[PDB]
């Protein structure tokens, strides 16, 4: 009994610790979401300034956007909880090889297998993900915007220099971040629920 009791309280501590890890990652992704919001604003504004302003001004917009990218990588790589750099692709959700997923095992209960799995990925190349991001598309859209001159070259009828494609893929990156944050919120709800059961059982 005692074994499982003290082990159970320790498991609850472990769970709260997992929650706070999620708090750090969640804050990083919150800020990432603010960045991507600003990016989308610049994409829309770039969209009209395919008429209004020149490749010089579009290049200024690109300066800002590229800086914002560099910050996204900066979040992905500086973000550490007790040194744990998470947002990097080390903890990809599902590699081609399941052996290389590097899944995250939080211990949750006192006994064997009373644990879970967690994964995460966001970085510069977090645009639309097929299995890789893609080649000329779905990677730069987060990393290197097309907002250099290429909107002055053509409207949305190209899909590689088209405005619609651009805006779409940005919105999809947003949907991946939003999805990740949503999952994490669910997970910490799960954890808290469990911690209630752990403390109860402990009593």
């Amino acid at each position: 009994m005692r074994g499982q009791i003290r082990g159970l309280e320790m498991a609850s501590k472990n769970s709260q610790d997992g929650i706070s890890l999620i708090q750090t990652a969640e804050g990083a992704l919150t800020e990432t979401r603010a960045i991507l919001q600003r990016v989308r604003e610049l994409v829309v504004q770039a969209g009209n300034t395919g008429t209004q302003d020149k490749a010089t001004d579009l290049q200024s917009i690109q300066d800002e956007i590229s800086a914002l990218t560099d910050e996204i990588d900066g979040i992905s790589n500086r973000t550490e909880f007790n040194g744990k750099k998470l947002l990097d692709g080390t903890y990809k959700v599902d590699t081609a090889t399941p052996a290389n997923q590097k899944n995250l095992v939080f211990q949750i209960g006192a006994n064997a297998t009373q644990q879970i799995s967690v994964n995460i990925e966001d970085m510069g190349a977090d645009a639309l993900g097929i299995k890789e991001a893609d080649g000329s598309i779905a990677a730069l859209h987060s990393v290197n915007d097309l907002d250099v001159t290429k909107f002055a070259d053509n409207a949305a009828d190209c899909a590689d220099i088209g405005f619609d494609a651009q805006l779409k893929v940005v919105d999809e990156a947003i949907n991946q971040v939003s999805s990740q944050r949503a999952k994490l919120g669910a997970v910490q709800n799960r954890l808290e629920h469990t911690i209630n059961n752990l403390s109860a059982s402990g009593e």
């Binding site: 501590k13 610790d17 708090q23 909880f81 007790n82």
Partner: protein, 50 residues
């Protein structure tokens, strides 16, 4: 967040720890009372001698 984890390791929950303080004291007081009872047997041994 790190502050929270730090505290969970470092900061004691002084409610529970107060209860443990209470408990350990009363166990000490009780224990002493048990000594005061323990050390009275020999004097009735003396009553057998006296």
């Amino acid at each position: 967040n790190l502050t929270a984890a730090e505290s969970r390791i470092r900061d004691v929950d002084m409610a529970k720890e107060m209860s443990e303080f209470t408990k350990n004291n009363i166990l000490s007081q009780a224990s002493q009372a048990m000594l005061a009872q323990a050390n009275q047997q020999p004097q009735n041994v003396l009553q057998l001698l006296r």
